[PDB]
Design a protein around this ligand. Structure first.
Ligand SMILES: [Ca+2]
Ligand SMILES: [Ca+2]
Ligand SMILES: [Ca+2]
Ligand SMILES: [Ca+2]
Ligand SMILES: [Ca+2]
Ligand SMILES: [Ca+2]
Ligand SMILES: [Ca+2]
Ligand SMILES: [Ca+2]
Lengths: 392, 392
């Protein structure tokens, strides 16, 4: 009776917790400044327990005089992975990021068709501590992918790296087709835009940031001025009490593998999988589902609702871990897909058949290398056990 | 290189696997017979590995002469938990089930407003083996909830219990408001409908079922005739090689707790949570989010897309387990919600405050009992440690 009450009440409270802990970047139109406004919350993990909240308030205004796109209300969804370079002696941060736009049922965008080089430069002043950061890398709006390496050019960074992430190129967000007209960021290019923020760290000081985001030649440049005030000396920021990265995250190798796998489905390379492409892939493997069935298949994983599957969605589908029995069975059926004649052994010809039909061109020697990598008993083919050890 | 190819190819194949392993019940309109047609797949787990597929083909026709509702294409989503009665010596099956309709952006329904008693009777003949099953329980279309106990009245059941589940009252499916007009099952009441199926077990025999589903007085009765043929003597069915239930499932106590918790949000008791009700709950706890923010909160968990949160959705949200740090932090913040004055101790007055504001009326002695259940050091209040042990 008492335990039932405690448990149910706890369930309700935690439910309210999960429902109102959204970390999305919320974007509205700022029609007076002819740009946009944004607001969101960042939750940093504190060493040995706790969370440091950072309230982001944001405004963006066009640099040029050309017409821009003023969006209806929508949001950006962001995934971030922070990592270190073992061969680096300088205070630094390796950053991988995926940003995709949702929330709804130009010339500048043409500048973001392929991979674009990125230069980031920041000069900061937190409680009198001057510092500088230089970063560089690549952005691919197609997949909404960002990959950069930042370095503190003034020695040791006086603030934790995660506090600078949101400050250190939203023009590389992937906007689905039905939302192409709501992309302010790309529409402001090549002239670019000014992005200003106030970031309030709960029970601590705040950042004020002003940034110029524009094309300089072929390079997307983000030049930043940051000013931090009212920070406590032994707070989570100046005291460096924030964790660098999260656990339970996919390694960049996992993400790479999933990226190539996704590339197998994504035929035109527009960064998303349609029913036509999935149907093509399945038809190549001998399965012929109908259009209705294909749409029914897409809808199950189409989280942001656009009738297709982008790369973060594919990532979510393939990172979702079920029961161990589910995994085992998934592997068994996969083996079923590889073993065409159902004779219990995957031959080189069958592996090559599956991979070629998937879209991957590979030679005799490569297929042979794969077989050799898997062939434990050395009989020239891959049985179920070997396949499982290869898949686990 | 080889491992990269193996891994990515495996990822693609498994992706195709997950995308095309949908277990939903797919419903279309059968305009000639003035009823419906349905098709779906059931995956049974085989002992020591493997899956037994069961292809369900279904047709339903009205019994009465009154007009019925012929739906546009949609589907039913089903969750099933099979359990045993320890105090039962007869061959039996305890069944808990949740069915909710989705897939789209009458007088009979009035018969399903509250809890309705259910009687099930089946006579079967599989490979010459006659048998009978009598089941009884309750259905609540509001939550799409079914709870029954079935018993083999002829001794030992010659087929595995899980093979009879789909055969052993889809009129208790929860149809969201925007889909009320697509509910054929309830519209055919009280006269009811005939439901016929052919269920093909891959590499084995098949079932042919004919059922009468109708009201007899106040009781919803499902009378079934089943005929099984072409089964292999040592197959998964006659050989009883199918597993009874899945692991990694919520116990009926967990489901009960989550049910009461859900009841706290569900103010009008219509089986779903709206933005108004969530806003009411949060306002009672001192938080005042806006309408836009409330909708933004709902949309994050609104899987089947109806602008609200039904009980299976709430179940999915609260059964989704994140990192251990996420759990710990969720508990910490929950404690924050309980501890109003932030003094580090949850008092009886505060617990009562939270619970009363949530909607639960409870007395001094009950709150005292809860405190006493949690109060480890016996100081009359609950600190963070005690709260955590209570929540874990
Ligand atoms: Ca594509
Ligand atoms: Ca999508
Ligand atoms: Ca073979
Ligand atoms: Ca071998
Ligand atoms: Ca309600
Ligand atoms: Ca819903
Ligand atoms: Ca207190
Ligand atoms: Ca105590």
């Amino acid at each position: 009776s008492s335990r039932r009450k405690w448990n149910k009440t706890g369930h309700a409270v935690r439910a309210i917790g999960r429902l109102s802990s959204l970390e999305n970047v919320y974007i509205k139109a700022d029609k007076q400044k002819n740009g946009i406004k944004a607001n969101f919350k960042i939750r940093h993990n504190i060493e040995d327990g706790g969370v440091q909240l950072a309230y982001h308030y944001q405004q963006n205004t066009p640099i040029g005089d050309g017409p821009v796109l003023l969006p209806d209300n929508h949001y950006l969804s962001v995934q971030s992975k922070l990592s270190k370079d073992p061969n680096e002696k300088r205070d630094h941060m390796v950053l991988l990021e995926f940003v995709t736009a949702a929330g709804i049922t130009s010339k500048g965008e043409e500048l973001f068709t392929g991979v674009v080089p990125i230069l980031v430069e920041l000069d900061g002043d937190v409680n009198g501590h001057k510092f500088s950061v230089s970063g560089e890398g690549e952005g691919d709006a197609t997949y909404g992918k960002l990959t950069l390496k930042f370095i503190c050019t003034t020695g040791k960074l006086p603030v934790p790296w995660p506090t600078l992430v949101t400050t250190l190129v939203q023009c590389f967000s992937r906007y689905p087709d039905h939302m192409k007209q709501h992309d302010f960021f790309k529409s402001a290019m090549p002239e670019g835009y000014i992005q200003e923020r106030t970031i309030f760290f709960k029970d601590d000081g705040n950042y004020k940031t002003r940034a110029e985001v524009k094309f300089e030649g072929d390079t997307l440049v983000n030049r930043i001025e940051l000013k931090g005030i009212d920070f406590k000396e032994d707070g989570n920021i100046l005291g460096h009490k924030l964790e660098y990265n999260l656990p339970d995250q996919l390694t960049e190798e996992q993400i790479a593998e999933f990226k190539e796998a996704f590339s197998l489905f994504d035929k035109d390379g527009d960064g998303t999988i349609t029913t036509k492409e999935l149907g093509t892939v399945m038809r190549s493997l001998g399965q012929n589902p109908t259009e209705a069935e294909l749409q029914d298949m897409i809808n199950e994983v189409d989280a942001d609702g656009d009738g297709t599957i982008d790369f973060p969605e594919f990532l979510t589908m393939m990172a979702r871990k079920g029961s161990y029995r589910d995994t085992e069975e998934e592997i068994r059926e996969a083996f079923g897909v590889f073993d065409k004649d159902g004779n219990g052994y995957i031959s080189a010809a069958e592996l090559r058949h599956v991979m070629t039909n998937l879209g991957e061109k590979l030679t005799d020697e490569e297929v042979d290398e794969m077989i050799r990598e898997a062939d434990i008993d050395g009989d020239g083919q891959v049985n179920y056990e070997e396949f499982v050890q290869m898949m686990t």
